[PDB]
Design a protein around this ligand. Structure first.
Ligand code: CLA
Ligand code: CLA
Ligand code: CLA
Ligand code: CLA
Ligand code: CLA
Ligand code: CLA
Ligand code: CLA
Ligand SMILES: CCCCCCCCCCCCCCCCCC(=O)OC[C@H](CO[C@@H]1O[C@H](CO)[C@H](O)[C@H](O)[C@H]1O)OC(=O)CCCCCCCCCCCCCCCCC
Ligand SMILES: CC1=C(C#C\C(C)=C/C=C/C(C)=C/C=C/C=C(C)/C=C/C=C(\C)C#CC2=C(C)C[C@@H](O)CC2(C)C)C(C)(C)C[C@H](O)C1
Ligand SMILES: CC1=C(C#C/C(C)=C/C=C/C(C)=C/C=C/C=C(C)/C=C/C=C(C)/C=C/C2=C(C)CCCC2(C)C)C(C)(C)C[C@H](O)C1
Ligand SMILES: CC1=C(C#C/C(C)=C/C=C/C(C)=C/C=C/C=C(C)/C=C/C=C(C)/C=C/C2=C(C)CCCC2(C)C)C(C)(C)C[C@H](O)C1
Lengths: 42, 25, 181, 170, 161, 178
């Protein structure tokens, strides 16, 4: 892989978008498989 | 379960028996 | 005899449509210039030589056992539990269910794990200069100076012929339903 | 000067004959804009897929595994979509194609020939001249099978008959 | 129970909310044929509504006279899972984020061009840092006690008073 | 200059045959972006946990502790049926073992700060079975091969348990195709 393309991929907007999409996908899949978690079950 | 590796007739159907029945069909 | 350049060694090719590769050294017994797929260029020669010898000796014992059990010769009392038939496959399954082949598996595996694995490992690692198939077994004393070949070469050739014979006999028994002879 | 295959077309400047099977055939000028290493990797991958596909149409209709039902190969795609074998084949092809991505990156760095996967376990190419000869044979069979697989699939779509039955009558 | 509220599994208004939601989905279900994908989607929504109301009724949540669960956040252990334990989970994740960001800032200060490290992230080093954040309370406290977290007042710029 | 495991790829830098199990297999370039010491320590940890895990997934079916809570032949059922305070004790003890065995250097910035710290060398040799110099490289090769085989085996055993709802040995004895 070209080092310049990797350096572009390491820029703040690209990494910001990828990390926030990754985080959003975690929240979405957690709420898909474990919905309606108003509380911590104890 | 008191059966063998291959050629079992009863409630014992092993993976080798599954391979053999798959080949002989 | 060892017949280097007639039966073995460099320059011998029994199947000349596939030329003898440059990889074969000619030191190994049974070197008759047959490696069309060039396996000798990259495999370890001691390991595959010992594997050829082990497959061959197993097939020789297999041919002798298959023929003596398909003709009808049996040990005393051996017909009763193992069935009074002559079919080798049913003999295998009957002796498995009796437990005889479990005992054979246990002892052959014990021998193979206890000395076979260390012999192969020390031969490959270069700690004993042990030759392939050399388990130092000569109780009756038949090769001392004739060991170079006319013992080794005849062993490997009979091994290969037994391999082909046992394979043929098994698949013929499958297609025909009747044991050999 | 001019193309060796098409005598009235000029030779494409990037087709200098370094790649085996070059007859100077590129009238649309794909090699004038795109990297020829990528194009040759694509050509060989498409062709090898097509060669395996044509051999699969011949054997897979001559013989069928006992643990599978019998059907036509075009209907076998639709059947194995639902059965789950097609997902397995797609997954394993994708898994190999990840290292194909790595191999393509190695080709773009000039450290790998555009078709060389170093896969010759039977040692069939001994010396150089054999390797060029088998390269020309592989490229020709790749292009030929690329045409032939489309022939097989489209002719099955029109006649609803497999190749070997289509040979026997009309 | 607490603050005059009743448990949701015995509140009649909680049951009325559940019945109203199920009826509102069922009157939409009535206009579609059985086996159609809208019918299956609506029945799945009905199942999710029923499961959610059952789970909320069996969780010890308290419902007011409106009919909705009311959270207790005064520190009592019978309702620690409504605010306190989600709070601990947030505080762990947030301290992780703060610790790894501070560590990356202090690494970037050592680089040849720090601002380039700010706009173009050193991804392996940043991934090392985000791996380090699982033990952030002990690491941050040891950073504090060794004088490496707080800087003295004579080394910070301030405006004229 | 080409990788031995993958002959169509160039040899990865920082892989030079020094470590045990090094066959030049790193097509994705993990060792070109991350340090080999952390990767080897992680590989040994994943492999050792999987050695214990595969051995458990086979043994717990055959041998149980007494009691109803320990009577599940299938390991994914034994995860839930075992007493919860015991499994939380297991979690806490593993945490203490990870804390003390790495000598308070647990992270990607402070583990291997001591130059004497070797990847996967926690100092663990209770019976001193490593007292042999020429045995060492073969021992490390055997350990990493057992760990890699255990990773593949335990991964397969868990997901086949999910598919079949059967413990591994009795799945092999009572096999049902999908
Ligand atoms: C700071 C404010 C705040 C807080 C404390 C919460 C807290 C919560 N929200 Mg909420 N939310 C917020 C702002 C907030 N949200 C905003 C601004 C919006 C609009 C964009 C939403 C839209 C929203 C929806 C649409 C949903 C939540 C859900 C949730 C719950 C998370 C369940 C979960 O992920 O389990 C974590 C599970 C693991 C296994 C880990 C939790 C009670 C979900 C829920 O369950 O509701 C009760 C849900 O469905 N929220
Ligand atoms: C190493 C191979 C081997 C050898 C040397 C023997 C030898 C013998 N077996 Mg024997 N056996 C064998 C394998 C062998 N068996 C196997 C593999 C099985 C498993 C099925 C048996 C099962 C078996 C039974 C069940 C019996 C024997 C018996 C006998 C004895 C009978 C001798 C006799 O009176 O002549 C008989 C000669 C003829 C009838 C031929 C004329 C003899 C010592 C018998 C005995 O009394 O043992 C002490 C007996 O009842 N064997
Ligand atoms: C074709 C048969 C044959 C021949 C010529 C050899 C030759 C050799 N073997 Mg060998 N071997 C064989 C079969 C054979 N082996 C089989 C089948 C086994 C497995 C049990 C072994 C296991 C073995 C070991 C473990 C070792 C050797 C060794 C040796 C070497 C020295 C010993 C010697 O001269 O014995 C040759 C002497 C004979 C073969 C005596 C003749 C006995 C006859 C053939 C018995 C036949 C029984 C019966 C009639 C079979 C027919 C029945 C059937 C028709 C139903 C020599 C290269 C030693 C060595 O240094 O390796 C290099 C060694 O360590 N061999
Ligand atoms: C507005 C001020 C205020 C504040 C700061 C608190 C703070 C607290 N309350 Mg609380 N409470 C308040 C008002 C307040 N309450 C009011 C007005 C009521 C009446 C409705 C209650 C009724 C109430 C109950 C019934 C209980 C608490 C408890 C607690 C403690 C639990 C948190 C914890 O884990 O600590 C304890 C743990 C540690 C200090 C260390 C753990 C690590 C916490 C100190 C619980 C408690 O244990 O109190 C002592 C408890 O059972 N509160
Ligand atoms: C390295 C991350 C970092 C850290 C440790 C802090 C720490 C602090 N900030 Mg600050 N801040 C940051 C980033 C950070 N800030 C950024 C990026 C912004 C611009 C949006 C601000 C804007 C900001 C304001 C406006 C205020 C603070 C305040 C504070 C203080 C209280 C905590 C707080 O309110 O958090 C809340 C923080 C935010 C709402 C903004 C955070 C934005 C993201 C989520 C954090 C950055 C994460 C970063 C991308 C990680 C990359 C690491 C990776 C490369 C390895 C504390 C000193 C407050 C203060 O003075 O209290 C005394 C205050 O009023 N900060
Ligand atoms: C990855 C490891 C692992 C995990 C998470 C589990 C998890 C579990 N096992 Mg199990 N087990 C394992 C490996 C594992 N096993 C191995 C290797 C064996 C063979 C010795 C067993 C034999 C075993 C039996 C006989 C039984 C269980 C049972 C159970 C369950 C209850 C806990 C219990 O009583 O443990 C019991 C644990 C043991 C008897 C041995 C555990 C020893 C481990 C491997 C620790 C050794 C390494 C340690 C961390 C020291 C290294 C430190 C160093 C690196 C610094 C639980 C689901 C019970 C159950 O529910 O039945 C199905 C039960 O009856 N286990
Ligand atoms: C130690 C490795 C190992 C072994 C021995 C098995 C064995 C098995 N698995 Mg399993 N599995 C494994 C790892 C393994 N798995 C891993 C790592 C996963 C991912 C988590 C899975 C996930 C998995 C699932 C999800 C399922 C199985 C199933 C099965 C069973 C049916 C086998 C089958 O259909 O294969 C068919 C595949 C083949 C015949 C292909 C064989 C190809 C060979 C290796 C030649 C390769 C040629 C290649 C080009 C040359 C390179 C190698 C050289 C040498 C069988 C008992 C199934 C089951 O339990 O049945 C109900 C099932 O549903 N496995
Ligand atoms: C989810 C349910 C919970 C399950 C989780 C179970 C928890 C598992 C058991 C806990 C095991 C977790 C290990 C704890 C992480 C410690 C890591 C660590 O300290 O990093 C080590 C960090 C490293 O910190 C760095 O250190 C450097 C040294 O030069 C510099 O000082 C740096 O500035 C500093 O950041 O700090 C330490 O050195 C401190 C060591 C203290 C460890 C002993 C902990 C004492 C136990 C606390 C209990 C007190 C009881 C409460 C009091 C009443
Ligand atoms: C360090 C040393 C210590 C030591 C120690 C420890 C206790 C040493 C023990 C190491 C042990 C745990 C080795 C475990 C190996 C298991 C691996 C190889 C295999 C899984 C098999 C795979 C292939 C499979 C599976 C398959 C699956 C996929 C599909 C199924 O259908 C079939 C099947 C089940 C076959 C001690 C304490 C002695 C002290 C000493 O001073 C120092
Ligand atoms: C959608 C679908 C599927 C499908 C499908 C597929 C794979 C469909 C079709 C695929 C392909 C590849 C079609 C075309 C093949 C080749 C052609 C036309 C070559 C022409 C060559 C010529 C004219 C040569 C000319 C020439 C000559 C004479 C010589 C000189 C040079 C030149 C001028 C070039 C399934 C079954 C896989 C899955 C699913 O269930 C449904
Ligand atoms: C490299 C190496 C080694 C090695 C090694 C080994 C052992 C490596 C790898 C071995 C194997 C067997 C890998 C793959 C296993 C199977 C998979 C992923 C199946 C997935 C199936 C699925 C998702 C099915 C899904 C399904 C489908 C499609 C449809 C039906 C539903 C369902 C069943 C769910 C050593 C140890 C010798 C050491 C050496 O020094 C280095």
């Amino acid at each position: 892989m070209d080092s310049n393309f990797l350096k572009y991929l390491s820029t703040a907007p690209v990494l910001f978008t990828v990390w926030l999409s990754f985080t959003a996908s975690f929240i979405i899949e957690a709420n898909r498989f474990f919905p309606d978690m108003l509380y911590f079950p104890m | 379960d008191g059966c063998g590796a291959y050629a079992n007739s009863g409630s014992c159907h092993t993976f080798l028996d599954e391979i053999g029945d798959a080949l002989k069909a | 005899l060892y017949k280097d350049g007639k039966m073995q060694g460099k320059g011998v090719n029994i199947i000349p449509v596939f030329a003898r590769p440059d990889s074969l050294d000619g030191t190994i017994p049974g070197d008759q210039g047959f490696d069309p797929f060039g396996f000798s260029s990259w495999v370890n020669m001691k390991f595959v030589s010992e594997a050829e010898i082990k497959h061959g000796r197993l097939a020789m014992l297999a041919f002798a056992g298959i023929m003596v059990e398909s003709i009808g010769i049996s040990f005393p009392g051996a017909t009763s539990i193992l069935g009074d038939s002559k079919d080798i496959f049913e003999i295998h399954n009957k002796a498995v269910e009796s437990g005889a082949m479990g005992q054979i598996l246990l002892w052959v595996g014990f021998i193979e794990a206890c000395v076979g694995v260390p012999a192969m490992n020390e031969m490959l690692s270069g700690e004993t200069s042990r030759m392939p198939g050399d388990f130092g077994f000569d109780p009756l004393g038949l090769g001392k100076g004739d060991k170079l070949a006319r013992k080794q070469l005849v062993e490997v050739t009979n091994g290969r012929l037994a391999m082909l014979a046992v394979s043929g006999i098994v698949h013929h028994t499958i297609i025909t339903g009747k044991g050999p002879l | 000067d001019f193309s060796a295959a098409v005598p009235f077309l000029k030779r494409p400047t990037n087709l200098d004959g370094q790649y085996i099977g070059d007859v100077g055939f590129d009238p649309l000028g794909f090699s004038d804009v795109f990297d020829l290493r990528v194009l040759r990797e694509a050509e060989l991958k498409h062709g090898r897929f097509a060669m395996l596909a044509t051999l699969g149409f011949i054997v897979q209709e001559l013989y069928t595994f006992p643990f599978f039902p019998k059907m036509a190969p075009v209907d076998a795609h639709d059947y194995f979509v639902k059965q789950g074998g097609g997902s397995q084949i797609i997954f394993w092809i994708s898994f190999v194609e990840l290292f194909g991505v790595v191999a393509l990156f190695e080709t773009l760095q000039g450290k790998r020939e555009p078709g060389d996967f170093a896969f010759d376990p039977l040692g069939l190419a001994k010396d150089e001249a054999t390797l060029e000869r088998y390269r020309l044979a592989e490229v020709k069979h790749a292009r030929l099978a690329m045409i032939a697989i489309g022939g097989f699939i489209h002719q099955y779509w029109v006649t609803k008959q497999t190749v070997l039955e289509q040979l026997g009558n009309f | 129970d607490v603050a005059g509220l009743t448990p949701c599994g015995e509140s009649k208004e909680f049951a009325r909310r559940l019945d109203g939601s199920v009826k509102k989905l069922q009157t939409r279900l009535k206009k579609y044929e059985a086996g159609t994908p809208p019918a299956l989607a609506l029945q799945k929504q009905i199942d999710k509504t029923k499961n959610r109301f059952d789970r909320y009724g069996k969780a010890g949540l308290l419902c007011g006279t409106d009919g909705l669960p009311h959270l207790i956040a005064d520190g009592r252990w019978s309702h620690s899972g409504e605010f306190v334990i989600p709070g601990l989970f947030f505080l762990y994740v947030a301290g992780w984020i703060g610790w790894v960001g501070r560590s990356y800032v202090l690494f970037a200060r050592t680089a040849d061009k720090p601002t380039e490290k700010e706009i173009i992230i050193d991804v392996p080093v940043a991934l090392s840092f985000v791996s380090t954040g699982f033990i952030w309370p002990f690491s941050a406290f040891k950073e504090f006690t060794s004088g490496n977290l707080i800087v003295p007042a004579d080394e910070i710029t301030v405006s004229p008073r | 200059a080409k990788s031995k495991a993958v002959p169509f790829l160039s040899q990865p830098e920082a892989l030079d045959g020094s470590m045990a199990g090094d066959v030049g297999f790193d097509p994705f370039g993990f060792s070109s972006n991350f340090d080999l010491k952390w990767l080897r320590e992680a590989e040994l940890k994943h492999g050792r946990i999987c050695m214990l895990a595969a051995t458990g997934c086979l043994v717990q079916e055959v041998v149980h502790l007494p009691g109803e809570a320990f009577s599940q032949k299938m390991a994914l059922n034994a995860w839930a049926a075992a007493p919860r305070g015991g499994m939380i004790s297991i979690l806490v003890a593993i945490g203490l073992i990870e804390l003390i065995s790495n000598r308070f250097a647990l992270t990607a910035t402070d583990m291997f700060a001591n130059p004497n710290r070797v990847p996967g060398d926690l100092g663990f040799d209770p019976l001193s079975l490593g007292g042999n110099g020429a045995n060492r490289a073969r021992m490390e090769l055997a350990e990493i091969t057992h760990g890699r085989a255990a990773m593949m085996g335990f991964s397969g055993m868990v997901h086949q348990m999910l598919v079949s709802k059967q413990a591994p040995i009795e799945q092999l004895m009572h096999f049902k195709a999908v």
